[PDB]
Amino acid sequence: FPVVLVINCGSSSIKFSVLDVATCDVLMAGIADGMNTENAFLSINGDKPINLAHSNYEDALKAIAFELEKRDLTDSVALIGHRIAHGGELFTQSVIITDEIIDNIRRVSPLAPLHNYANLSGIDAARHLFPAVRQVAVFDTSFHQTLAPEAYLYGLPWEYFSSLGVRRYGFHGTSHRYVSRRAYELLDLDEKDSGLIVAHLGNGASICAVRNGQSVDTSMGMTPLEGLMMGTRSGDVDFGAMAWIAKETGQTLSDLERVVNKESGLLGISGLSSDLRVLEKAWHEGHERARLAIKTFVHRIARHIAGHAASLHRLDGIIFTGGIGENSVLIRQLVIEHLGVLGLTLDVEMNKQPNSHGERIISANPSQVICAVIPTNEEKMIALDAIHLGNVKA
Amino acid sequence: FPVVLVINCGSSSIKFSVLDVATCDVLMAGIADGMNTENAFLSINGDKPINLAHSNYEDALKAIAFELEKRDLTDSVALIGHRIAHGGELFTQSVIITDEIIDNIRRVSPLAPLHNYANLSGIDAARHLFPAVRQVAVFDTSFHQTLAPEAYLYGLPWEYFSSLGVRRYGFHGTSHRYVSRRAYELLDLDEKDSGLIVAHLGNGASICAVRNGQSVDTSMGMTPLEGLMMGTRSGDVDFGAMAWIAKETGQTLSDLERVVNKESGLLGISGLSSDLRVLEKAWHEGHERARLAIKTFVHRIARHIAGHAASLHRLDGIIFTGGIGENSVLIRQLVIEHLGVLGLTLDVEMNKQPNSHGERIISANPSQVICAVIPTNEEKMIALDAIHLGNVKA
């Protein structure tokens, strides 16, 4: 009974999942958080954080690998899937990892210095500890590679694009790809003749316009920073306003990049929390700045959902997904009420239902556009790619 | 037969118009270009650029004033209208200029250092040369002041808004106000129950969502830089991509602000021209980068028109205006074809017609949204404000 080992080897931590091939369901999931810092620990299923301190990426994965053998699961690992942050222009689909692939990941790595090098560390580790196991690289940008130049060009001098690689790449590709696939079945649509908007709201937040099965426009830019306002990310911001701030308070570009990543977004406007559940409660208890942050949040999503609709010949579906997307009854409704212009009528009985109801329609019949909630499963999509690439012979 | 003197006293030049009160039509128009530079000149009606060299704002207006008396027009100046770039939060409508008003303009002037101080120079001049003439200040932001906080807040720390004044202000207010007013009559709509999108495409480019006679969302930000890609302005740009560029090529924020204002936009992608007529011809003659620049240009407009529609309960009209908006048969159509999703069908016979046809419908009957061209008249709107404020007693 073979299994797929999924790895999101981020900068600060190493997340992992062990999916069964037969069911595509998680048998085991863990995390190696606080990496390289004096005390690094491994928390599998959340039962006991074993302090594997004084250790790096190579041994943290060797700690996870030993625990797989503790559960007699090592011998059953047929495939390993690696989540990669940035594919650049070089990667349009998931690939079997060879030396050539490692090189090409290393080539585009300047575009995501924090994430990509951390991903490569995890690739080497898994390659070392499991050499006779087929390994797959799944990229977080590759879905958005179907974008036409008018969709991905910035209004900068052409040289910044041709020699340096400055363009729109977009992120949450795997999520957007997964959810879109699921929507065709749920909504009973023809992939070859369809237009969807997918709102991935959660950790980061992004919108994708999926036309006839292809990503044609997406909210995020070169960095995960452009687009929607997020938990701690500012979203769309006037560069003139930024340059003004840098002059008025005398801050370096380095200062502001840290401000826009860590101090901004929902956290920034509310001055309270980056967490929705806290801000939803905060508003319910007469907090204006938490209410404002949500109202702004909802507005920018509503702006980008309608915006991205332009890249469709027809609008069949708006799909909510991700932590906030799947669970927030409020945000979903405020967003939809904001889009009455698109002819949306929302069934509030259906919108009430918690996430346990999984893939569900949430718009009433008179609606000209079908709204739905689809739980995102990046782990399942990574596995499916790996299983598919498993049958191939390289 | 009284007249209104309109002044756009920009940083580099001083434009002016002399409108008749009875007709609201231009009797005289000129420009004092290349200000303060060794050779400054005055070109009235474009007949003879008289080199009033070695001179500043106070004497350039004194050169225009003498030429008004040369045409026995000085004694007939009942009102003077000043175009102001940035009103800040302090100005929501046009006002009669008093000392208090001068102060308040001087207060918000840090927000537009290039433009506002140039505007104040022209106010002092006109005040000096015409002391017994009522003068009106018309602000380029004041129309957009009806925006709700969720529409104008950036996802930055709240402090940047409350103490420093960093928010969305928007521009082309006077144009957006004028055109919207004209649309109600042209489209035979009820102002109190209407939703319009106005695309001001020309010099700079901006979109405004006008709901029930009020500006509820607009493309430009704190600076005229945010929003649509423009002639030499980049438009919406990822801050992460900007910060990346500053690292990769080692450029100061000052460098990039100059790059994004002067070297970017249509000029940047094409590497040829910031002028549409040149780029339209260039594409017609197999130039890919000029074609790409236009395709990108059209796409971003299509993105923002659909985007701004979200802030409406209903979409009745899309209105094209400004240099590019009124004259470009191509751009208008490419934009509308991009918005087939909103249910637009375009009458190409009507879209063919040149600007001489003035205020015209350009969408066919089966269209769910009325498209129209309305020539913008900032001069006429400034005059109308002044005439109105002329009847008031301060």
Ligand SMILES: Nc1ccn([C@@H]2O[C@H](COP(=O)(O)O)[C@@H](O)[C@H]2O)c(=O)n1
């Ligand atoms: N019941 C829940 C669960 C999560 N959430 C929100 O979803 C977000 C988590 O998103 P991800 O899991 O995609 O990172 C958190 O910001 C949290 O506030 C919520 O608003 N209601």
Ligand SMILES: Nc1ccn([C@@H]2O[C@H](COP(=O)(O)O)[C@@H](O)[C@H]2O)c(=O)n1
């Ligand atoms: N017939 C015309 C006239 C002007 N234009 C464009 O309109 C723009 C001028 O806009 P403004 O007058 O608003 O500054 C120029 O970029 C020019 O290329 C055009 O494309 N066709």
